[PDB]
Every structure is written in structure tokens, then in C-alpha cells.
Enzyme design. Structure first.
Site, mmCIF file in Angstrom:
data_model
loop_
_atom_site.group_PDB
_atom_site.id
_atom_site.type_symbol
_atom_site.label_atom_id
_atom_site.label_comp_id
_atom_site.label_asym_id
_atom_site.label_seq_id
_atom_site.Cartn_x
_atom_site.Cartn_y
_atom_site.Cartn_z
ATOM 1 N N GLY A 248 24.475 30.770 36.311
ATOM 2 C CA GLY A 248 25.230 31.915 36.777
ATOM 3 C C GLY A 248 26.423 31.566 37.640
ATOM 4 O O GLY A 248 26.280 30.965 38.707
ATOM 5 N N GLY B 86 30.107 33.583 38.898
ATOM 6 C CA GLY B 86 30.882 34.802 38.910
ATOM 7 C C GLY B 86 30.361 35.849 37.945
ATOM 8 O O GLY B 86 31.040 36.231 36.989
ATOM 9 N N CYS C 76 33.334 40.867 41.098
ATOM 10 C CA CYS C 76 32.831 40.053 42.190
ATOM 11 C C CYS C 76 33.980 39.320 42.879
ATOM 12 O O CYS C 76 35.118 39.302 42.406
ATOM 13 C CB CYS C 76 31.787 39.061 41.683
ATOM 14 S SG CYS C 76 32.455 37.674 40.746
#
Lengths: 470, 470, 470, 470
Positions: free
Chosen positions: D296, D298, D303
Site C-alpha cells: 500500500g 498512497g 490523500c
């Protein structure tokens, strides 16, 4: 050519919200190993270029941006005398020490307070017979009578250093100083300028953009109407390092004629023309003699241009197509999409642009020529596209009778003034430059590129649906 | 046929928000070089047509729109005597000078204030024995007693000119006048009308839409029920230049019968029928004898029709399909999608429509027949679909017993009244026409089209995802 | 099979917001020519079925909905004695005259006011020794002391008629009456019921749904746990016309066993089972012996079920697939997607469903069993899924020790109570039925279908992007 | 391999909002028949892993999560002595009885009130010479003077039991008790701990995650800088059961070197490395010697990382690709996408992840190390990423001179502090664990899987458009 993940073949044009960068294998240990210098011949060491907007393109703007490696384009309608004066002022600045706000001991305290906001330093230096005598801060002048003078407010306790000393030494001297501003002085003892403690670090981070004679670079714009050749020759003689031929719709007969006229003079400067959003327009502008093509027309899906006419193109697809077309002919493209986040600059550089044009975002800064205003909640803000309208009607004022001015003014909308709030943590434009360059450097380290050409060569992109925005 | 960028083949129907125009190469130097005349036989010189809505289609509306080159359709339920009176009033107007608000010196000041808002001029001319004696403005009458009369308020200082003088001369005369209204008078000295300083320019910009006898054009609508032939013949005898057969669902047996009945009379007028959203329906309506097909059913994704029934079609795809089908048979189509921005008019013209129907948007204007209202914040507004419901129930009032009226009224929703705020900068409908025509002309210059047929022939379109709207 | 426009082949599942109906050629002159009767064997004359929710499925609900051609399913956890009592009460009602609120002259005025809101009539009839003596309205009792009695409030001026008179005559009698309620009385003179003026029209519009003996129809639900066969036999003996085997997840071993157990009894009633969202599940449920399959699991993209588990399916695609699978085996499907607009009912019928289940939407009505509440702004509202939780824990109360009740109750969320506001214009459920049936009839006239089978056979559908919702 | 419905082949990457699970045939009668144990070698019995965030990873957090079958990763910058102390404290806890808040009778009442919120029990036990003497609740201490002591507040009426008694018996004893807390005591009579009535059920629902010696498990993180081997060896000697090598950008030379260095020591512990979002990065990290790859980068479309740099990937597609790549080499992947709903955990497990990392969501709990704060409306909240920034600058404090600290700190954003409100119904982290596990178990029953491997093998997924979110 930008590479896309397998199967990502959308049946539509892409905006910045439609795409993302996929991290590759990276040997770039730190963001400081990344070289942000551009190759388009503009001479900038950072990809940021400041748009030729009257509310943004000031002389303070030009100095501050050029010192950090950017470049500023002067508005097209500025008189040639003012252009020459601004160019001389910019090219007389120092490459390391910033020009401070200065005050004589006889000016009113109110005028000192008003001038204090013209720079990010937050303090002014009082000068007497060319010598510095004290510093004055906001809190010092704020607690005194409205009619008091500067003389009995300034405090003589300030840090000073000769010009040419190592900026690290200036940082060390300012570590325990009560005021973050050190006064640099010529060996004659006259006031030379000031260094903020952050400026000493920035001078090591950023390389100034300088011409062959070592002076700061600046550019100027020309309109597509009138004698374009004479205006271009005058601006080149005034010392402008780069010329921008700007109109809302490039790829029209008048632009081709103007580009041919300017290129015939053989001034030897890089020539920017725009805007276009198609490969055919880019090819036409390059063949006419332009070296750099400025890209972007009605970028936003709810912008004024598209709501009025339905004309435009999403920025990412336009930049990709135009950059490919220009690189086919050995040209370069500038992205003029209205950047609002560092993501936009990074994605424009990934798409293939050599430089990025930043406009109203820089309006909400101290160095912008507009005056500071305060909202009901005393929050600082500035009006983008405010008084600048006058300059526009100045181009109409030189024209025909009031009848023709009203006739042409019938099919025109009202001024699109905007409230650009100043960030308290990023009031100075140097903070915004730090923000943008931090984003770009992080993108380069994620891709694993040591420089912008490697960023364009190695980037991998994917496409996301709108459902992720819910 | 509308051309699309390569690979743009969506698997769904397109709205105006799904498409954009790509700028082509353009030789059109200025927006004034563009000819906006339509070829559908309606005789309009601008593509704007005003919908047959009771809250919009007034006599002031008809005069003002026809003078600038548009056309207004009268509601279907207006009595034939009122239709004849309105047609005579419209066809007795002058092509250049606007009909002013006039007052006798004995009317109450309150009535003068109320009537002042019926026109965009902002001033009334007091008349005595057919002669003008003074002007009265809002600020003048506002500062006087509620029971005062007009006599002792009017000011005799006003600019005057004979009819037939050059509008440029009227503009010159009004340059330094304290009031922007000049009174034009017949050579007999009787009151002929007024010119606003902006009206003098508009008279040079816009060509009036006139019939063979040089009078302003007007159209009238007919329902699909009753003796359609008799109503059509009566309206044609009353002098209506164009007939619209209107129902919420075209492409049904009753519409085919009504179109055949009207065409059998061979009145020689253009015949409009709608609405349909399919090529088959357009072919059927044209074969039945209609010359123009009105397009659009439940255009919005959250409109009343689609939320009630799920029936409709996105406007862009429907207009493209119907325009292609009609041009196959040599017909024309009108876009009736509920325009709210000039982008919609430009895109409808690009898709292939010959004219655009504008409805509730024009409700919030001075020239609309509805009375002015003021919100809590004293902002001016008007109620769209307000009192007009009565006219609808009038069609029910002529029908059967109250039992049948209640039975038919059971499956009916409440009135969809809407608060249409008036733009302070665009209170008059002429300002909205200027807005729309400015958008269309800019679109034509971006595409590089000198006229609407060239706009349809040369436009290039692309498709965008929804992610750009985040 | 639902037909789609050419090229409309999405790579995803469709919700009601993704699709629209395209108008076809139509011979249906009026909405009253459309027959809404269903063919699934449920005996309803309108496609509306009322869900077996405790907050909705009341005895007043059952009577009112069955009289207009719908059907109501009683909750599964209702005791068998209460089920028998409710069935007898419903099957003792009149097919035309509605059962009124009745009051003795000795009850408190406050109790009369509280009971007044239990029906849409808005007035109660005072009864003495089985005879009507006067009417009482809200405004009459509202202006009197809190401790006053009914006796000295009722007004003896009311319209009366014998039972069996033509409803048109009742409409005529009530035209000029001050109160819109006429009292119908048996030839013995005893109180038989009331007709509202709107009810007289509704009695001509809607055909009641009646069993072979001419009494109103009603259905009852069973759980998948315990002795399903015994419960089904008891409910069938109590007189329920249709049985629903309901669980949150159909297509599991326990449901197959329960369906087999119920079908083995050969009760001869239609058997409904759900929910499933796949063709395989529909085939399994039909092969197990179910006649009707209820469709829908986690329909909304932000519903509780999908936010908790990510499990669900968009309603349109699920209904299409399940309806095709069931029609392959000669079964029928019910749409249980949580209807909120008439568009949903129309689209569910177009997809191929024979009936539509309506749940919490009907909670905000007078006839719902919940008590009326008032917000801070005195707006009427009702709590959906409020006290009904007790019934749920009643199923737990009959179970094991408090230890097991707490253990099973650990993995359970709190009650999802919802504020269902009552529409002032549509406070009664008959108004909502009118709304829904008006939408469905308009859809049928747009498609050109005289009945629901023709609606499914002739509908044409298209797909729209999300950009139209911006 | 995740199976998709026929024709569902999107031309873009998928987020959790883009996909849904289709219910299959299911034999799983109840949620308690589902086994949630993981096979990645981490030893957890629930798929929940707690992220190594300073605002979340506390010692109370580690104890409470490990007792219910989860595991907590200690932050990388915690000193080795504190790591050893925390590991010893966690491994000295009881597997069934929770460690209570304890008070001597001499502490101030204010300190007792402050400490009361450190656990979900809601009551503290006063201890004297190692013996319990009374209970103290919030309401008891709240009604007394600010300077009062604990002695004269505690109430000696409390339920007590010996350690080792059946938790069902403790539940029975507490049924009618006025306080839901029973004190468990060693046979010596010294205070051993407390059981909440809900804890007695949870002890039967959840199996603790224990090492080979039967003590609670805990993990610790290491940075990629410095001597990674020495730090890893020290942490392994301190008793950490699992090591996480964490950096914002995995798949870089420094991570490969660090993984090789740690694997060379042959500590025998599972080794986690991340983050990556590509199959190539997963292959490189596994070949370097990592056993588990954390996925994972961004994840969110808005975000901080993607708005700064445009770098990232939608979580679902990244997890699918990385899980497939890792299972090709016999590895496992952890989803680190920022879970906010149980849907995210269920979908991550369906995509192929063996465990899920939960971060800031657990910050708003009593067991989090941050102190409780109250808003203007006295609502409890905690600051995520608040004081923890100090720890970050602690890593800078050990570094070079203040000059280098400011230089590196120039290209850094401000602290992203967040207000995590505590759910009044779910103030304790055990309630959030119950929520998440309930969602996962419901997903497994809908799919028809008895365990997580069956969930990955049997799940069927579909894709939805964004239009369902309107």
C-alpha cells in the site's frame, strides 16, 4: 512516450484526477540527489515559471523567483519604460542576499507598518545616510501611537556580517539571535541587504537562474496585435531574456503572422507561443518559428471558458499529445493548466512538459504586487484579477472612440476577481516554491529518476475511476 | 456528422457534461465576423427561440426578443382574441426604437414605481396630450409620499431626437447626459419611443427578424386535442408566422393525426412538432408533414419526468441522432433540453440543431409577464410556473363536470414553482441574449467557422470522464 | 428480454441511476387505458406489495392497501392468535367503504385527538348505541379544555347515505358539504362506515384485490428456523392467501430444506422465497418448490450491509438476471431493492419483475402501526425500526439462557432507527399509491404498452454516465 | 485467483468502492462456525494487525489486542530498554483475566478520575498491601471535592472469584450485580485482575494469540537506516516474535540491503517488508529474504501522498497483483491501505491478503497511549499524529548539527494531526474488534466459506459504476 499499465486504454481524455504514478525501482537515496534543471533553453534550474499576470508578475516577484531558479514573465501591456526599469532593477540584485525593506527615521510609523508586509522577512532595517541604524518589527511598531515616527522605535541590537561570508556562518550567528534577520553590509559599511536564517539554507538548496553575464533572468510578453516586431525588438533591447507571444487562442492566422514577424528579426532569444491543445497546432506554431509551445485551453470542466463556450481539453491528454508532437520536431512545451497542487506540476513534468506555468496560486503571497487586505476575521487575502482590469481597458483606452470601446465591451463578461487567502505558514512565495519542489523531488525519488529527462523516460502511469472520489 | 477524436467510442449516451469542443485552425479574426443566421426557415437571425411558457411568453417578451432577431412562441391556451391583439401589438412596433413605459401626470406615484420595473430602461416618460413632458426615475419617485402624484415629480430635462437619426448620433448625444435614455419623437412631435445608450449599440449589432412586410415575427402554439385544424387556421389568419404542435410525448397516433390535419390545410407556414428523442420518431413526424422536429424528453438525470417515470434521454446523443435523421430527409431540429448556460446552446448547435428553445431561464427577467417579487433579503425574483397553473386548469375548466376534473386531477403532481432570481447585472433579457450570443460567437471563432453551417461541418468533439468534476 | 441501444455494453453492473427508458411509438391515449394487473398468481391488481416490516405491516395498512389492489405481508414473529385476529378483521371489511375511527360520547377529548391521526379521513364519527350522532374534526376538539369530553363537542350536521349507493352520487352530495366525509349506513341505520370525497373517485380507479370468496387478500411470513411446516400449516389454516419464507441470505441449505418442507404439505398457496441476487440461486429456489423468488441483497452502494461486509449487487442487473432465470423455469420474481421513487418501481417492472416490495417508505404514513411523533418544528414523523426491535429480541427471548442471548447479541449492531417524515400533501398511504401508480402508468404510455407484460416486451433501455449527475 | 463476473473487464484500477461480493451457495449455518485463523506464520487468530504508529501502539494496546488474537507492532524509534520492558509486561499478562487499573487509598480523587479512562472497564479497584478493598466508579468520584482522597470514596461491595473459574460462572455471578466488574484473585488472596461481564463472553469467542511458551505475542519494527542487523538482533533478543522493516517506499536499494542484512542473521522470525504496490517489487522483496510483503502506497485519491506527488495505486488492484505475485513464490502479503470500515478488511481478505494492518482508526480508543481530550461539546476525542512528531524529530535529534536538521526539515510538511472521536457505544478497542470480526464472519457466511483460504478460493466479485454513489 508515457507508458501505461496493461489494459488501461480509456475511451476518453484524462485529467490530473484520472491518472496516478506507479512507483518503480529506485536508486535515488534522497531528494537532494535529484537535479531539477530544465533543458528547454529557458535557463531555469527549477521547472516553475511564473505567469504573465498583472496581479502576480511584480518586480519583487521577479527578483525572488529568479534568485531561487525560476523565471517571471512581465505582462504584455506594461509600458516599455517600466519594462526597462524593472529589468535593470532585477539585474542589479545580488545572487545571495535579498533586497530588504528600508526606512528613513522620519517616515510615519503607519507607513512602516504598511511597508512591512511587502516582504517575507517580517522586519525592516532603518537607514541613515546609507548606513543601517536599527531593526523594526511588527510587534514593535504595533504598540505605539498612530502618529509616532520610526526614529524612537528602532532597536540598535541586530546581527551584522560582511557580504561574501559563508551562509552557514550566517546561520550559526543567527541561532541564538532574538531576531531571525542578519544585516549584510559592503566592506564600505553601507547597507547591502539582509539574510533570513531560512534564506541561508535556501541559498545552498537553490541555484539562481543567471544569464551569461551572471545577472538574474527575466522574460517579457508581447501581444498579437499592432507591430509585434517592433515591440519584440524593443523588449529584447531592454534586456529581456525570453519572449512570450500570448493569446487565448493560438493556432490562428494572426499568431502565425506574429511568430513569423518575430522570428524574422533573428533576435536569438527563445520564443514561446500559445495556447494550443492539439498536435496540429503545436506543429504549426513550431514551423512558424516558435521554440516553445504553451499548452492549455479551458482546462477545467467548470471553468469560465468551458461554461461560456464548451471549448477546451483535459490538461493531461493535451500535454501528452502536444509534448509528443513537439519532441517530434525537437521543440518543447510549457504546461499552462492552472496548477493548484504540486501533484499537477509533477504530472505535467511526467507527461512530457519541460516547464510549468503557475498563475493565480502565487497571487496570495507577500511578493505579489497587489496590496494586502483583511477579511472580517482579519485573515489576510489578496484580490486576483482586481485592479489589473484597468490595464486591460488601457489596451482599449489607446484604441478608438468611446463608441467602439462600448461596442467591443458589450460581448465581455465582468471581472473574475478571486479571494486568494495567504497561508500563515506559507505567506512567502519561497515557501510555496519549497512545497512544489518537495513534491517534484519526492515524485522523482518514487519513480527512481535522477533528473527530469529520466522522470519522463521511466514513469509508469495508471488510470482510476471516479468512484474513488466518493 | 459530428466528428470525434480517435478512440472516443463510449458505451453510453452523452450529456453536455460529457463532451467538449477541440479548437481547430481559425481564420475568424473577431466575433463580429460570425453570422448567426439560421436556415431552418423560421427567419430568426440568432439561434435563440423562446419557449411557449405562460410565465415567459409575454407581449413585451415577444417585442424585445423579435427586435434582436429571436422569436417567441405564444402559449397554446391563450384565447384567439388575445392572440390577435398581441400579434397586432407586436407587428405595430418599431424595428429600432423600443416602446417605453408611459405615464399620465395624474397617476399615483406608487403605480409609477410599480410600472417602472416592467422594462429594462429604468425610467418612464410622462405624456400629456400625446406629448412628452418629463422623465421619472426610481430614485426620484422613491423619495416622495406614498400618495403623491406624478405631476410634481417629473423633471423636464431630458435628451430628445427625431425618429430616423443615426443610432451613433444618439449614442454621442447621451455620452454626457445625466440620464441614459433619449426620447425619440415623430416629426409631428408626438412621443414615438425611447433609446437606451446600450440599445443604440445593440441596434447595430443585432438585425431584427422581420416577415416579408417588414414587421416583427411571432409564432403561436396549438394543442393536440380538439379541432387542431380549425385552431391552426385561426392562428394563421391572426398573423402568426410559425405554428408549433406541442405535447409532452411526440411520436404517438394523436400527434400524427394532428400534423396530418394541419398540413392538409396547406397554410404555407413552417410546422414544428415534438417532442421526440429517437430517429424513428423524427422520421415519423417529418413524414406526417412537419418541417421542424422539437427534440428533448426528460433531459436531466434528476428531473421530474425521470424521477417519476425513468423515461428520457441525455440531450446531446438525442440531438445528434435526431439531427442526422432529419437532415437525411431535409428537415431541421430544435433543441428543447432546458438550456441554463451558453455552453448548452453552443453544444446544441454543434450537434446539428438549427435552433435552440430557451424556457424558464428567461423567466427571471423584467420583460417576463410575471410580476416582480422580493425575498427576505429584498433580492428580486419571479415565480416560474406560478399563476400559469390556472391556465392549465382553464383547459380543464372548459371540460367535463367537476367529477371528471377531480378524476383526471388525481394522477397529477403539484405545481413545480421555482424561484428564478434576477441578475442585477443582467436584469434585462437583452443582457442574457448578449451573454448567449457572446458564448456562441466565441465557440465559432474557436472552431474557425464563419457561420452555423460551418460550425456543424467543422467541429471536433471529445469525451471526458466524470472524474474531472471532483 | 430487455433490449438495449446499440453499443451499450457496459463492463459493470447497473443501478437504477445507470439506465433510462427510451420512448417508443405509443397508441395508448391516456393513463386510464393501462391495466396494471399482475400475473404472478398473487392476485394483486397493482404491482405494489407491502414488506413484512413490523413498523409498516399493520392491520390498518393491510385493509387500506388491499382495498386499492395491493397486498400486505404480516411479520413472521407475530403470534398465531394475533395473525388470526388480523386476518378475520381484514376479511370482514367492506370492499368500497372505509372503516372509520369511532368514538363513544364519554371518552376524553385528548384520546379523541390522539385517535384522529390513525386514519387519513381527518374526522371521527361519534357513535351511540350503534348509531352515528355527529362528526368531530381536529380544529373542533383542539379549541377546548384538556379534560373536556366528546359529548359537547360533536356536531350533528353531517352528510349521510345508505350503503350500496353509486360513489358518483356520494361525490355529488359532498361537493358543497362543509366536511369532506359522508357517513354510509346500513339499511338498519347502524354505522357502516365513511367515504371521503377522494375515496369515491379511488373506488372507481382501483379494483380491490379479493380472494375466491370476495374478501380482501392478506399474506403472512414464516422464518427459516424451527418447525417451518407447522407454522406454514397454521398460517394457511388462519386464512393467509400467500406465504413468504424470508431470510437475509437465500440460497443456503436451511432455505432449501424449509422450502421443501413447506412444499411437501401441498397447501396450494403461492410460495415466496428470498433473497437472492444470482441466477443460480433463483434456479435452486424454484427447483426446491418456490413459485416466486424475492430478489435483492445489499442494494445500495452505501447501505449497512455493504459497508459491513462488502456483499451485495446493484438492483437492476440482479433483477434482470433473476427474472430471466425464473422465466426460463416459468417462475416469477419480486423486486425487494428498497424503493424510494416511482422510477424504481417502473424500472423494476421493465427489468422483468412481476411485483415490487415497498418497505420503509410506507412507514411515514397514518395507516402505519407506529405512533405519530413531532419534531422541534412540530413536523410529523415516525420512527422506522424503533420499538420493532423488541419483537426481534422476542425471537431471542424464547431462546436459551441470558448467556446465549448475550453471546449471540455480541455480533449485532445497534438499531437502525430512521426518521420518516410524513408528507403534508401525502400523509395517507393512498396518496403514495396514487403517486406510484401515476408514475407506472406514465411509463407504460411512454413505452406504448397497454399492460405490464407489454411493458416488459416492448421497453428499450439506454445507459448514462455518472457525469450527468454533476 | 479472484474470479469476476462475465464481461467485467475494466480499463482502470479498482478501489474498494469499485467492487462488490456476489453471494454464493453457503452451508455455513452461523457466524461462529467460521475460523478466522491466519496462515502467514504471524500466529494471529484474527486477521487484524495493529500498525506501528506511536499514537496507537501502546502497551495496553498490545495486551488487549493480543489477548483477543491480534498482534501489535511497536514503533521503530522506541528505545531498546523500553521495548524490553513492554515485551516483559505483555508476556507477564494473563490469557483470560484483564489487568485492571489499581489505586492506593492515598492518591487524589482527581488522579483516580484521570486514570479511570485508561481502560474500558469503567471502574478501578483500590488496593492495600496487595489486597483489594473496594471499587470506585466514575459517578462515585465525580460527586466529591477536588481535593478528596480515594479512601473515603471506595465501596467494599464487589463481586469476587478465584482465578481459574469458568467464565460462564463469572457471567452468572455478575447477572444481578450492581457493577459489571468481578475481581479475580489468586488463591493467596492477592489481586489478580478483573473480568467485565462482556469479557467473559469474549474469552469464549476469541482465542488468544500465544507463542510456543504460552505467552502473548508482540512484534517490533526497525528502520532502514543505521545498523539494521544490530537493531534486529537486539529486538529478537528482547523477545519480539516478528520483525517489520518499514519505509514509505519499499523496492529500493536500501530496503534490499536491509532485508539481506536481517536475513543473514538467520533469527528464524517472520520478516515483514514494505510498502510496495507492484508485482515486481513484491518479487524483489521476497527474493531478498522477506517472508511477508506489506502492500500500500498512497491509497486514497485525495490523500496527502497523492496530492503532494501523484504517486500511489488503488488498494484493491495493488493487493490482488501483489498477493498473486507473492503466492507464486509462496509468500504472503499484508494490506496496509488505511482501513476505515469492516468492508475494507473483508475485501482485502477476499483479494488474497493474509492479514490487514489497521492504523489511525484504533487511535480513538481508551487503550491507545494518547491522553483523552474533550471538545467544546465535551465529546471525547484523541489527537492522531500529535505528540508523536517529537519521536520523529528524536530520530533527527540524534543526527547532525541544527544546520542539517533545518536543511532536512525544509522539505517537510507540518504535522497531520487528526481529531479521532471516540464512539460512545464503541469506546473500547474490543468493541471495534467485535465490529470488524462480525463483518468478516458475515462475509464468510455469505460466500459460504468456513475459513479465510476458502474465502479467497470461492469469492466472486463484480464491478459497479460511480453512478450508484449519487
Amino acid at each position: 512516450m508515457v507508458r501505461f499499465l496493461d489494459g488501461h486504454t480509456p475511451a476518453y481524455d484524462l485529467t490530473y484526477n484520472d491518472v496516478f504514478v506507479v512507483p518503480g525501482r529506485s536508486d535515488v537515496a534522497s531528494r537532494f540527489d535529484v537535479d531539477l534543471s530544465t533543458v528547454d533553453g529557458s535557463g531555469t534550474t527549477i521547472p516553475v515559471v511564473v505567469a504573465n499576470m498583472t496581479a502576480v508578475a511584480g518586480r519583487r516577484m521577479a527578483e525572488t523567483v529568479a534568485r531561487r531558479g525560476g523565471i517571471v514573465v512581465l505582462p504584455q501591456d506594461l509600458p516599455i519604460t517600466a519594462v526597462s526599469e524593472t529589468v535593470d532593477f532585477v539585474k542589479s540584485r545580488d545572487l545571495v542576499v535579498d533586497t530588504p525593506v528600508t526606512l528613513s527615521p522620519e517616515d510615519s510609523v503607519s507607513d512602516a507598518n504598511a511597508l512591512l508586509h511587502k516582504r517575507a522577512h517580517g522586519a525592516a532595517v532603518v537607514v541613515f545616510e546609507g548606513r543601517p541604524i536599527g531593526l523594526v518589527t511588527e510587534a514593535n511598531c504595533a504598540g505605539v501611537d498612530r502618529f509616532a515616527r520610526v526614529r524612537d522605535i528602532a532597536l540598535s541590537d541586530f546581527v551584522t556580517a560582511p557580504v561574501g561570508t559563508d551562509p552557514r556562518e550566517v546561520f550559526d550567528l543567527l541561532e541564538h539571535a532574538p531576531i531571525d534577520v542578519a544585516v549584510m553590509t559592503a566592506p564600505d559599511g553601507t547597507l547591502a541587504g539582509v539574510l533570513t536564517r531560512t534564506g541561508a539554507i535556501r541559498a545552498g538548496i537553490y541555484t539562481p537562474a543567471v544569464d551569461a553575464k551572471g545577472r538574474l533572468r527575466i522574460a517579457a510578453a508581447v501581444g498579437i496585435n499592432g507591430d509585434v516586431g517592433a515591440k519584440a525588438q524593443a523588449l529584447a533591447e531592454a534586456g529581456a531574456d525570453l519572449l512570450v507571444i500570448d493569446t487565448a487562442h493560438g493556432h490562428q492566422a494572426k499568431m502565425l503572422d506574429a511568430i513569423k514577424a518575430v522570428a524574422s528579426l533573428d533576435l536569438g532569444l527563445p520564443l514561446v507561443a500559445g495556447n494550443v491543445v492539439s498536435a496540429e497546432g503545436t506543429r504549426d506554431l513550431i514551423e512558424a518559428g516558435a521554440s516553445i509551445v504553451k499548452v492549455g485551453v479551458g482546462p477545467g470542466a467548470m471553468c469560465t471558458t468551458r461554461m461560456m463556450t464548451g471549448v477546451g481539453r483535459p490538461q493531461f491528454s493535451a500535454v501528452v499529445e502536444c509534448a509528443a508532437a513537439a519532441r517530434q520536431l525537437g521543440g518543447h512545451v510549457w504546461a499552462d493548466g492552472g496548477v493548484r497542487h504540486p501533484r499537477d506540476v509533477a504530472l505535467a513534468l511526467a507527461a512530457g512538459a519541460s516547464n510549468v506555468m503557475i498563475g493565480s496560486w502565487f497571487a496570495g503571497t507577500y511578493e505579489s504586487p497587489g496590496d494586502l487586505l483583511f477579511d472580517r476575521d482579519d485573515r489576510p487575502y489578496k484580490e486576483s484579477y482586481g485592479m489589473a482590469s484597468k490595464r486591460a481597458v488601457a489596451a482599449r483606452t489607446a484604441g478608438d472612440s468611446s463608441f467602439d470601446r462600448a461596442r467591443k465591451g458589450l460581448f465581455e463578461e465582468g471581472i473574475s476577481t478571486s479571494r486568494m487567502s495567504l497561508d500563515p505558514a506559507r505567506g512567502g512565495v519561497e515557501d510555496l516554491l519549497d512545497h512544489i519542489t518537495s513534491g517534484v523531488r519526492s515524485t522523482c525519488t518514487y519513480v527512481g529518476a535522477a533528473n527530469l529527462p529520466e522522470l519522463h523516460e521511466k514513469v509508469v502511469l495508471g488510470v482510476q475511476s471516479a468512484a474513488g472520489f466518493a
